Design an enzyme around this catalytic site. Sequence first.
Site, PDB file in Angstrom:
ATOM      1  CG  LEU A  22      94.415  -0.326  51.077  1.00  0.00           C
ATOM      2  CD1 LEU A  22      93.053  -0.308  50.692  1.00  0.00           C
ATOM      3  CD2 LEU A  22      94.338   0.492  52.439  1.00  0.00           C
ATOM      4  CD  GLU A  30      86.641  -1.677  51.567  1.00  0.00           C
ATOM      5  OE1 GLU A  30      85.744  -1.438  52.465  1.00  0.00           O
ATOM      6  OE2 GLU A  30      87.548  -0.784  51.102  1.00  0.00           O
TER       7      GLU A  30
HETATM    8  N1  LIG Z   1      92.296  -0.467  55.600  1.00  0.00           N
HETATM    9  C1  LIG Z   1      91.876   0.797  55.828  1.00  0.00           C
HETATM   10  O1  LIG Z   1      90.639   1.030  56.275  1.00  0.00           O
HETATM   11  C2  LIG Z   1      92.751   1.840  56.151  1.00  0.00           C
HETATM   12  C3  LIG Z   1      94.068   1.859  55.979  1.00  0.00           C
HETATM   13  N2  LIG Z   1      94.968   2.751  55.893  1.00  0.00           N
HETATM   14  C4  LIG Z   1      96.301   2.217  55.717  1.00  0.00           C
HETATM   15  O2  LIG Z   1      96.886   2.395  57.276  1.00  0.00           O
HETATM   16  C5  LIG Z   1      97.998   3.161  57.359  1.00  0.00           C
HETATM   17  C6  LIG Z   1      98.160   4.656  57.795  1.00  0.00           C
HETATM   18  O3  LIG Z   1      97.732   4.589  59.383  1.00  0.00           O
HETATM   19  P1  LIG Z   1      98.830   4.987  60.593  1.00  0.00           P
HETATM   20  O4  LIG Z   1     100.260   4.866  60.357  1.00  0.00           O
HETATM   21  O5  LIG Z   1      98.018   4.550  61.362  1.00  0.00           O
HETATM   22  O6  LIG Z   1      98.574   6.850  60.412  1.00  0.00           O
HETATM   23  P2  LIG Z   1      97.605   8.086  60.396  1.00  0.00           P
HETATM   24  O7  LIG Z   1      96.927   8.110  59.285  1.00  0.00           O
HETATM   25  O8  LIG Z   1      96.808   8.014  61.847  1.00  0.00           O
HETATM   26  O9  LIG Z   1      98.669   9.206  60.573  1.00  0.00           O
HETATM   27  C7  LIG Z   1      99.525   9.056  61.640  1.00  0.00           C
HETATM   28  C8  LIG Z   1      99.987  10.448  61.909  1.00  0.00           C
HETATM   29  O10 LIG Z   1      98.619  11.378  61.936  1.00  0.00           O
HETATM   30  C9  LIG Z   1      99.014  12.340  63.120  1.00  0.00           C
HETATM   31  N3  LIG Z   1      97.957  12.086  64.023  1.00  0.00           N
HETATM   32  C10 LIG Z   1      97.270  10.831  63.931  1.00  0.00           C
HETATM   33  N4  LIG Z   1      96.561  10.929  64.911  1.00  0.00           N
HETATM   34  C11 LIG Z   1      96.372  12.089  65.452  1.00  0.00           C
HETATM   35  C12 LIG Z   1      95.771  13.143  66.120  1.00  0.00           C
HETATM   36  N5  LIG Z   1      94.678  12.375  67.106  1.00  0.00           N
HETATM   37  N6  LIG Z   1      95.915  13.890  66.531  1.00  0.00           N
HETATM   38  C13 LIG Z   1      96.829  14.865  65.994  1.00  0.00           C
HETATM   39  N7  LIG Z   1      97.691  14.187  64.789  1.00  0.00           N
HETATM   40  C14 LIG Z   1      97.417  12.986  64.671  1.00  0.00           C
HETATM   41  C15 LIG Z   1     100.448  12.331  63.376  1.00  0.00           C
HETATM   42  O11 LIG Z   1     101.216  13.088  62.637  1.00  0.00           O
HETATM   43  P3  LIG Z   1     102.018  14.325  63.158  1.00  0.00           P
HETATM   44  O12 LIG Z   1     103.274  13.461  63.597  1.00  0.00           O
HETATM   45  O13 LIG Z   1     102.428  15.129  61.859  1.00  0.00           O
HETATM   46  O14 LIG Z   1     101.473  14.755  64.412  1.00  0.00           O
HETATM   47  C16 LIG Z   1     100.667  10.818  63.219  1.00  0.00           C
HETATM   48  O15 LIG Z   1     102.214  10.680  62.814  1.00  0.00           O
HETATM   49  C17 LIG Z   1      98.526   3.337  55.931  1.00  0.00           C
HETATM   50  O16 LIG Z   1      99.311   2.110  55.507  1.00  0.00           O
HETATM   51  C18 LIG Z   1      97.157   3.347  55.354  1.00  0.00           C
HETATM   52  O17 LIG Z   1      97.410   3.203  53.854  1.00  0.00           O
HETATM   53  C19 LIG Z   1      94.539   4.016  56.598  1.00  0.00           C
HETATM   54  C20 LIG Z   1      93.168   4.010  56.903  1.00  0.00           C
HETATM   55  C21 LIG Z   1      92.380   2.870  56.365  1.00  0.00           C
HETATM   56  C1  LIG Z   2      91.256   4.636  54.303  1.00  0.00           C
HETATM   57  C2  LIG Z   2      90.308   3.405  53.605  1.00  0.00           C
HETATM   58  C3  LIG Z   2      91.189   3.342  52.170  1.00  0.00           C
HETATM   59  S1  LIG Z   2      92.619   3.991  51.519  1.00  0.00           S
HETATM   60  C4  LIG Z   2      91.586   4.875  50.187  1.00  0.00           C
HETATM   61  C5  LIG Z   2      90.588   5.621  50.436  1.00  0.00           C
HETATM   62  C6  LIG Z   2      90.182   6.422  49.382  1.00  0.00           C
HETATM   63  C7  LIG Z   2      90.618   6.621  48.081  1.00  0.00           C
HETATM   64  F1  LIG Z   2      89.967   7.298  47.385  1.00  0.00           F
HETATM   65  C8  LIG Z   2      91.802   5.834  47.904  1.00  0.00           C
HETATM   66  F2  LIG Z   2      92.351   5.890  46.801  1.00  0.00           F
HETATM   67  C9  LIG Z   2      92.426   5.104  49.121  1.00  0.00           C
HETATM   68  F3  LIG Z   2      93.676   4.553  48.897  1.00  0.00           F
HETATM   69  S2  LIG Z   2      90.312   2.112  51.558  1.00  0.00           S
HETATM   70  C10 LIG Z   2      89.134   1.916  52.687  1.00  0.00           C
HETATM   71  C11 LIG Z   2      89.496   2.779  53.865  1.00  0.00           C
HETATM   72  C12 LIG Z   2      88.547   3.042  54.902  1.00  0.00           C
HETATM   73  N1  LIG Z   2      89.088   3.886  55.700  1.00  0.00           N
HETATM   74  N2  LIG Z   2      87.448   2.166  54.972  1.00  0.00           N
HETATM   75  C13 LIG Z   2      87.342   1.268  53.956  1.00  0.00           C
HETATM   76  N3  LIG Z   2      85.890   0.488  53.978  1.00  0.00           N
HETATM   77  N4  LIG Z   2      88.014   1.358  52.736  1.00  0.00           N
END
Ligand SMILES: NC(=O)C1=CN([C@@H]2O[C@H](COP(=O)(O)OP(=O)(O)OC[C@H]3O[C@@H](n4cnc5c(N)ncnc54)[C@H](OP(=O)(O)O)[C@@H]3O)[C@@H](O)[C@H]2O)C=CC1
Ligand SMILES: *[C][C@@]1(*)=C(*)(*)(*)(S[C@]2(*)=[C][C]=C(F)C(F)=C2(*)(*)F*)[S@@](*)(*)C2(*)(*)(*)=C1(*)(*)[C@](*)([N])=N(*)C(*)(*)([N]*)=[N@@]2(*)*
Length: 186
Positions: A22, A30
């Site tokens: 993150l 959170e």
């Molecule tokens: N703040 C938050 O709420 C959240 C934070 N995060 C953070 O965000 C970043 C991760 O996100 P991001 O780079 O967007 O990556 P994703 O988690 O979307 O992963 C991307 C990979 O997933 C596969 N992929 C994604 N979409 C599809 C699909 N529709 N169908 C089939 N395969 C798919 C592909 O892998 P392949 O190449 O193998 O096909 C692609 O290379 C990280 O830093 C993470 O820690 C993640 C979630 C929530």
């Molecule tokens: C995807 C995400 C977070 S990353 C994350 C999720 C769960 C967990 F157990 C972790 F250790 C971890 F790093 S945190 C978060 C989200 C999303 N998708 N939404 C919210 N609100 N917070």
Amino acid sequence: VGSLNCIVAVSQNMGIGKNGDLPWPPLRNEFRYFQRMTTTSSVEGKQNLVIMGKKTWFSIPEKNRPLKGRINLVLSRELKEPPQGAHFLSRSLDDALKLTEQPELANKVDMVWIVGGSSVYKEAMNHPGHLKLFVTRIMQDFESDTFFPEIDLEKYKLLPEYPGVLSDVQEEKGIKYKFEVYEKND
Ligand SMILES: NC(=O)C1=CN([C@@H]2O[C@H](COP(=O)(O)OP(=O)(O)OC[C@H]3O[C@@H](n4cnc5c(N)ncnc54)[C@H](OP(=O)(O)O)[C@@H]3O)[C@@H](O)[C@H]2O)C=CC1
Ligand SMILES: *[C][C@@]1(*)=C(*)(*)(*)(S[C@]2(*)=[C][C]=C(F)C(F)=C2(*)(*)F*)[S@@](*)(*)C2(*)(*)(*)=C1(*)(*)[C@](*)([N])=N(*)C(*)(*)([N]*)=[N@@]2(*)*
């Protein structure tokens, strides 16, 4: 199968990730909220499904994988089987969603939660239907390399309240944040 929902936490500059983590230091309450909202079913003897991309999966600490008490499905076109600890692997968002309508899953899944990252969120957000977004607003800028897609306010309405969701500003480690819910139906 019940509701489809996205859940994310996002900085003021639309940031969600940096270098596989993150953008901000860990906010326990959170994560706790994320766990609670994703895990809680509104039905008896059904489980919620979480759908995430491959990089999201590997960004979760291994001790927290799979996300307990949920069906974990990972998206990837490169993997040929679910990662160690995961449950299902799908090659597209249509396929995960089609997959929920199997006899095997259909009467087992309540809510489906898309939990990241950017491409999964963009496709769901722009697809016609009933969709809610649970958005935590992290109330500052953080340097990011992965961003949340635009929220079109003409279609997504910010709800003025929602059961089980605090409206008030929160603060942990000197960082203020706020829980929001948006809903479209098109
Ligand atoms: N703040 C938050 O709420 C959240 C934070 N995060 C953070 O965000 C970043 C991760 O996100 P991001 O780079 O967007 O990556 P994703 O988690 O979307 O992963 C991307 C990979 O997933 C596969 N992929 C994604 N979409 C599809 C699909 N529709 N169908 C089939 N395969 C798919 C592909 O892998 P392949 O190449 O193998 O096909 C692609 O290379 C990280 O830093 C993470 O820690 C993640 C979630 C929530
Ligand atoms: C995807 C995400 C977070 S990353 C994350 C999720 C769960 C967990 F157990 C972790 F250790 C971890 F790093 S945190 C978060 C989200 C999303 N998708 N939404 C919210 N609100 N917070």
